[PDB]
Design a protein around this ligand. Structure first.
Ligand SMILES: CNS(=O)(=O)c1ccc(Nc2ncc3ccc(C(=O)N4CCC[C@@H]4C)cc3n2)c(C)c1
Length: 288
């Protein structure tokens, strides 16, 4: 068990537990080791076979004592730190394009196996110095749920939550991850979060003030959803030229389709990979 791992240093804190850089004494490997204090065993075990170059590899599940240990491949840094480092200059658009293209590939793979993430955010998008970006903590939400506060009581962010989740749908689809990635795409471009809400209703109303309050025309069935209130204010939609300047029209077209209100109209990961915005996509080397 854990005797085979030498903790090197603490590198993060998830909603469920703490993450260490560790050395596997048996293999020589450097890994990221997450310790969770305590159906899950089977669901998490399934995730070990969800291998893709844009998914952080789950190397091992160790179940000993009242604790679950997940061993991951080690990556250099997360996208949140990189965005913060690029606050003055911005991430170059070719690199933005490459990151979005790679994450959509990851998403199309997971979604094809009917796995959703449900909690995408810059902090679980991890990068290396080659130019790769990978989705992390994939599928761990279906096991335990997404809490209001982490095990350290930090507030879990709502900024990337799709509107059908915020409106109280409990049987939502892969489209929720397309929404989250669209919010992240916009944030890389503008260097500001698109919808930085600090409560569920503040989050919902920020979406409404930019994209228009949804109605039965743009989203059939919306007015019957669990948390929908007829007393919601009615705001007009803004034009994307105001939302993400200076993204070109291909990028604005793609972003608008990732942010469609109706989950059934929202673009899939697979159709997004065919969008003309990626006609000239390349794999640049980032400056970390
Ligand atoms: C501190 N921000 S950093 O300074 O830029 C930063 C971020 C990540 C890592 N590397 C890393 N590698 C694999 C992981 C695999 C999984 C996890 C993990 O369980 N999570 C739960 C919360 C979010 C994260 C995905 C973290 C990993 N973290 C490093 C060395 C630095």
């Amino acid at each position: 068990f854990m005797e085979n791992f030498q903790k090197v240093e603490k590198i993060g804190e998830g909603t469920y537990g703490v993450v260490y850089k560790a050395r596997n004494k048996l293999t020589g490997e450097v890994v990221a080791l997450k310790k969770i204090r305590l159906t899950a065993i089977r669901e998490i075990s399934l995730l070990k076979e969800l291998n893709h170059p844009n998914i952080v590899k789950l190397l091992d599940v160790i179940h000993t004592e009242n604790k679950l240990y997940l061993v991951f491949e080690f990556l250099h840094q997360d996208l949140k730190k990189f965005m913060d480092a690029s606050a003055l200059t911005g991430i170059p658009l070719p690199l933005i394009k490459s990151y979005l293209f790679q994450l959509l590939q990851g998403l199309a793979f997971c979604h094809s196996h009917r796995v959703l993430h449900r909690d995408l955010k810059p902090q679980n998008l991890l990068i290396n110095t080659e130019g790769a970006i990978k989705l992390a903590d994939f599928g761990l939400a279906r096991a335990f749920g997404v809490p209001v506060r982490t095990y350290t009581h930090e507030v879990v962010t709502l900024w990337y939550r799709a509107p059908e989740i915020l409106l109280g749908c409990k049987y939502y689809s892969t489209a929720v991850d397309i929404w989250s990635l669209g919010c992240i795409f916009a944030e890389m471009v503008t260097r500001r979060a698109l919808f930085p809400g600090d409560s569920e209703i503040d989050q919902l109303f920020r979406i409404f003030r930019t994209l228009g309050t949804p109605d039965e025309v743009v989203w059939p069935g919306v007015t019957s959803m669990p948390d929908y209130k007829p007393s919601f204010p009615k705001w007009a939609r803004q034009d994307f030229s105001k939302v993400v300047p200076p993204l070109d029209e291909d990028g604005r077209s793609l972003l608008s389709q990732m942010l469609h209100y109706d989950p059934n109209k929202r673009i899939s990961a697979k159709a997004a990979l065919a969008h003309p915005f990626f006609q000239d996509v390349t794999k640049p080397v980032p400056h970390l």
